[PDB]
Design a protein around this ligand. Sequence first.
Ligand SMILES: [Cl-]
Ligand SMILES: [Zn+2]
Ligand SMILES: [Zn+2]
Ligand SMILES: [Zn+2]
Ligand SMILES: [Zn+2]
Ligand SMILES: [Zn+2]
Ligand SMILES: [Zn+2]
Lengths: 49, 396, 397, 396, 396, 133
Amino acid sequence: NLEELMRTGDYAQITNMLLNNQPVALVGALPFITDSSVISLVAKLDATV
Amino acid sequence: MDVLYSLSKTLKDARDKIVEGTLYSNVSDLIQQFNQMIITMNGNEFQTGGIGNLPIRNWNFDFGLLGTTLLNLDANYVETARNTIDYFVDFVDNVCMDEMVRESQRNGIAPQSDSLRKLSGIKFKRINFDNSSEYIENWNLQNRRQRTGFTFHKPNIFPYSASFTLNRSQPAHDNLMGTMWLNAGSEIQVAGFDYSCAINAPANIQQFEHIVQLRRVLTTATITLLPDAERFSFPRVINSADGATTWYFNPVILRPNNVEVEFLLNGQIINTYQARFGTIIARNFDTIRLSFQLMRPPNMTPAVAALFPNAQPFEHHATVGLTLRIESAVCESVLADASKTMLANVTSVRQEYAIPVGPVFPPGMNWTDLITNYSPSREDNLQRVFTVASIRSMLV
Amino acid sequence: MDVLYSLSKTLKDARDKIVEGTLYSNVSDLIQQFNQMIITMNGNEFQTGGIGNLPIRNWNFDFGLLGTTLLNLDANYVETARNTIDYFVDFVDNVCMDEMVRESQRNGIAPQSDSLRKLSGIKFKRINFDNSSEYIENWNLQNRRQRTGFTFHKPNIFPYSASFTLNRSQPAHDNLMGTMWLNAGSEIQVAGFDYSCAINAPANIQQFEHIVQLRRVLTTATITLLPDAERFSFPRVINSADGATTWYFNPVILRPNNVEVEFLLNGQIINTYQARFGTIIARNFDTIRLSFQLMRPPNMTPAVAALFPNAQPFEHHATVGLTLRIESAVCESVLADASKTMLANVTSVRQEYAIPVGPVFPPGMNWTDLITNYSPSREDNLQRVFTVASIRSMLVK
Amino acid sequence: MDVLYSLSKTLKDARDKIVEGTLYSNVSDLIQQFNQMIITMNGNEFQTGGIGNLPIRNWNFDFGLLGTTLLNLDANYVETARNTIDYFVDFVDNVCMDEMVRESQRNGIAPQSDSLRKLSGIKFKRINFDNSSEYIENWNLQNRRQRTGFTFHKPNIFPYSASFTLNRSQPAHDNLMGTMWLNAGSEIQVAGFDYSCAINAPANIQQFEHIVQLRRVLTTATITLLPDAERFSFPRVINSADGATTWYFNPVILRPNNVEVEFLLNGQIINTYQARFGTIIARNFDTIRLSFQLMRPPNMTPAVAALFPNAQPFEHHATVGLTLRIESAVCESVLADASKTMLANVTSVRQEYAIPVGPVFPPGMNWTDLITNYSPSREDNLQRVFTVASIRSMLV
Amino acid sequence: MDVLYSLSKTLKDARDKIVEGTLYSNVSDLIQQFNQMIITMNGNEFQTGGIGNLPIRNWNFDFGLLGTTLLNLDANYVETARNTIDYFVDFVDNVCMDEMVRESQRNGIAPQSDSLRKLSGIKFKRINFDNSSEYIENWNLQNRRQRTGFTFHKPNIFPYSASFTLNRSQPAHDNLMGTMWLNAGSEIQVAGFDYSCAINAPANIQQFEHIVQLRRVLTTATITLLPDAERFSFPRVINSADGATTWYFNPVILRPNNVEVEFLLNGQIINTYQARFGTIIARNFDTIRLSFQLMRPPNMTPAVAALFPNAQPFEHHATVGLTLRIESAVCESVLADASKTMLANVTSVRQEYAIPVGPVFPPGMNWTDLITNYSPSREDNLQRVFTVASIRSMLV
Amino acid sequence: MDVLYSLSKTLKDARDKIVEGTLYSNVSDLIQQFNQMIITMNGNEFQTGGIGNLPIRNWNFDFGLLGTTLLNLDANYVETARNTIDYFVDFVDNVCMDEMVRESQRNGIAPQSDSLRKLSGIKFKRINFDNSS
Ligand SMILES: [Cl-]
Ligand SMILES: [Zn+2]
Ligand SMILES: [Zn+2]
Ligand SMILES: [Zn+2]
Ligand SMILES: [Zn+2]
Ligand SMILES: [Zn+2]
Ligand SMILES: [Zn+2]
């Protein structure tokens, strides 16, 4: 839960999962970028955010 | 093993300390250790079972960390923690059961289950913390080749054996001299009998000797000596040595004479007790030598003299007993005892899931056969399963 | 209960850890727990003991907090802490004694004394901290209705019973066949006797059976089985069943034949041991069946043959024994055992203050009566009083 | 003692908790206590031994502190800690052994070895921390003059004594009335015998009494009482009281009548049980009175009537037995029991180094002599050495 | 179980309260609970199992919420609600049936069907609301370790048994003294018969005693006691104990004498009624002891004196009877009774789908075998299935 | 014991040395010790027990200091000192009697009566002075 992560300030679990490439689901109202570029998909820019 | 023990102890501390209304300061270190365990275990896939009737179970860890409270824990915190604790406890119990049912002739001290083998990896060493139980302490010492010590109340050191030896006998079994003994658990009960009551023995003394070779060295042992062996003080019909015939025993009990208990280590006399009964201390020994004598009473009342004629037939047979009871001791190796449940736990787990007989332990984990042939490989495997059994006992 | 246990645990930790010269870092969490206890108990009145000879004690709490500015504990700090600890320990002892002497037919697991009832309020739940003792852990598991477990060394599971059964008899009591047993504590000594030594038996085999029904299920039980029963291997003069006369028992011990120990749960075979002696494991059972045979030795030496004639009179009577000893076991219910003092403590407190017989427990806390009729209400009350006894033993003992 | 126990406890916690991969949060307080111990012990010279064959050993303490900036402990930290831990453990073991082998009459509670006397200084109290063990807890209670308590499983309270008394006797020993008993550890087997089967008794009843005085008061005692004394239920030839001759005992067992076991404190009846067998509770007592009766069976079958004639000879002798076993108890004084090992440890240390017999304890640390004459000075010295033995058992 | 009951109660309330023309204020909270249930169940896949002939069924939930903005409910609202209610009722009924046909030995109180196990998850705890029915209330109280009881009208506590005991008998069965009884359901009929009419009995009184040991403790029990057992008051031809022959019974009914009915708990007399008939109250008991006496009438008219001669043949046999009917009671455990339909529902569901015999219940859910061996595992499974059966009865 | 002995010694010295007409230089150190004893004992409540027929006695200490500033002790000084000394001597005698009648099998060298156990605290160590007997 991104709200709980924001409120606690403890980023140990999220940091450990992102460093170790552990599949996760971040839940919360999020703005998103609509990308229509196929080259962006090939470049895998969605995994760099 | 250390990581599995640490998981179990973290879960035990979580169950004991994470209780409603407790100050967060009473659990701060415990909560940090628990969250470290959650971080280390998350994302790891484990499998247990697949042996006998133990079901195959797959374990996944996708738990969030335990939170914090300003002053005291509330009910919500306890329930949220208890869900995770329950899952982890189920996992730990299953891992312990998987490890307890396995054995190896080669490297019997090493983990045998896939889950415990995975838990021995470097990544999980983070979970390791306080190792204060007796079994885990001895495990760590043994891994370092340090002197181990297990304290047993009434150690199960003597394999069951009810046997006799006839030093003088003949096919009619009416004039017999010998010894009959029971070595069961932590108890020795020996009795030397002479049918002629040492009428023709030199100086009217008949010497009886019993030797018990302990399969492991016992140290700091408290032992109770009693003059009489009640188990062999009543008349009984005993099979022959070859089972062809039965003979008759009709004890009349006399005080054992010149009693001598020698506790020996590697053939060297360590402790000697002469005509001493009650509590004695055997500091370090692997052999017990009980030497006693039937001394014919030089003076007898008419009733007593009636029982012991100058010649045959002998109807009342003079018996001198001796009872030895190891109340407590210390052994460098693991043994069954009346105070612990490790053997019972391992045997129960093996019986419940119908584990086929392996190449290390005897069928059914029978203690008599196990202690009779207590090989170093058997010792390693039994220490491993006993340590896992204690780890499981922390939670189950 | 958890609040009372937490009080006792805090006081024991204070006695053990608040010592002169110790680093404040060794006790900081303990000092916080102690001050939490002081704050929670301050301003509260308690009353303990209006049953039997137990005196009415009134308890007031107005104590200052322990300091936290020190780096190493000194003498004066320890003495003030000891004064507060002594008062609190006396209060906890009296509360435990008051709770141990009371029983309820309805909610025996619930608190009975008014002091423990008051401690069961929300405001005192703050005192609750580490519940690590075996009895309190089992209490908490049972409250949530999880699988409880109590480990007993030599569990007292068999009520005392020294009796006999005659399968063959007649008024002269000179040709008897039957069994005599003692079931006491954790021990069963049984012995089957035949006065004729199975001379006219079907193939010279006499079958003896003994069924012992435990009042609670035992798990993970280590059991020693020995072939002989020394208790029934000497001459005896035994009253008849009606007490009209006395008969003579002159046993000669023969080894038992086809020994079979069966450990059953709900009339279903869990464990079976055949001709096995020494240490055995009964993993889960509530009934024991010992079946053993007296087999006439086909070949006898002249003395043995003289023992057993072809017909009466039978001067020597063949006997085959068995001894069973539960060394250790696990039971989901509380029990008296050789190692613990819970039953002894409860009985001692009840006798000391002359507590009248209640509607739950037998007249005098007699364990044979209790285990003979170990009802669920008796189980609840016994678990409650045993847990309180352990809590008290943490401090008073 | 408190300082020595604190040293041992700190070392044991260092062994258990300073392990590879553990969070520094799990050991921070322990590391602080360990460094405090190093600081307090540094610059101090100690000397142990010099008694019996215990070698003289000199101990110097110049050690560096452990690090405190780690997040998780690694191999280097563990080895650095373990060197100091090994030296300190050896020092503590030697101090404990030196203290266990010494005794004083007037002030036996106070430290005897020079090392422990030096450790009893004010400056060493900084080492002092958690005193949670039962023996150190009782030591601190005794030092504060509070009520003390030790729980014993099967307390060894009865010195060994197999004796008899003949209330009716003749030189031929054919019409004997009396009682024979064994008191051993936590066991009392008594058996009253009448050779005439109380045919001439007033009401055909023979009254037997046995009073056993305990050398210390036992409280919260759980006892098992059984109606037969197997020890005296078989035929035996027994020496005479003066040893001049021997007599014949041929028991036939009848159930005891009007059994009454009384537990007394200072001559006042605290507990009483009539015709009660199984588990009983003696809440507080120092004496046991077992009074039983042999009642002649008014109705006898022809065999039973054949056993007991109207007059001599009496070939079958009526016997009624009682068995009393203290399974658990609480005593304000230290005692040897089946579950603990302090007596064994002290005796082993005294034996291994050939400690000359002192002015307090009996030779060889024999328990029967010690408990027979359990004087206050002996109690002081025994409590001291038992506490030292427990402290040593924490490490060795 | 709480979530399943909440689903059933929500559906029952929806059926009862969502009716055309009703004010929305009459259903506002009900509609809120129904929408909460829809939200919690939406997106979840469920499977009700294929045990026996019960078909495998799959359940999906993608329902929309109900309106909340009308002043009064109309036909469209009722139809829209009914479309969802039918599906939810079918799902709940199938889950209840799947749970009712399953049993376990280790944990019979825990859910057995995978659907109910899924519903026991935290995510479904939102569905839980008012738990007011007796069975769910008892379930919740028993999960809280709180004293709770079920009230039964004519409890089925006595296993069926029509038997007799002959204290005096002979191969010809013409002078018999004994007792006959039927213990069936909530009813006990007993009758002591003497063929000689106590002609040669001490004081011309024959004592009969009948003990019925209840398998569970009953409390606040209203009981009708009547002085005659009509079941054993007419001529009968009765098989012998071994079935070898048949004997003749020709009762002549006399008033029972010294009628003492004791209701005992743990062997202690809780309630006693002497010569009392009609309504009596047994407040708490587990055993019923009926003692009565056949008293030979001291004075007999010539017709009466002809029935009871001084010796054989005895053609009229004097019988005294008692009848004990438990009209109402309270039991900690669940029981079959004449008022409730739990046993009937469970048996019907198990019979209709050919559920094989399991390891807990007897074949066909036979109540006599069930209550004869009412083991704790049987009690747990029976309470579980009975609660599920009540939940289903709320809808089916 | 050393505190009790010091109380007795101070009282005996006061009785022997605080006499009418004596130079203050003959008692200066004695007066200092006596005032130290008064300060240490002031505000402390003692109880001599009721073992046997020994009466239960309660002792309260609220005494002014002995004066300085006299060249030779006069009668008023000696009277005030005698009042204080009489009360203190009664207390010390009762404490000694209470201690003399008690015993313990173990730790019999330690104080038995509550008064002497209280006197064994650190705060009373100030009273301790010359131990010459
Ligand atoms: Cl034991
Ligand atoms: Zn032979
Ligand atoms: Zn034991
Ligand atoms: Zn009989
Ligand atoms: Zn003699
Ligand atoms: Zn009706
Ligand atoms: Zn018949």
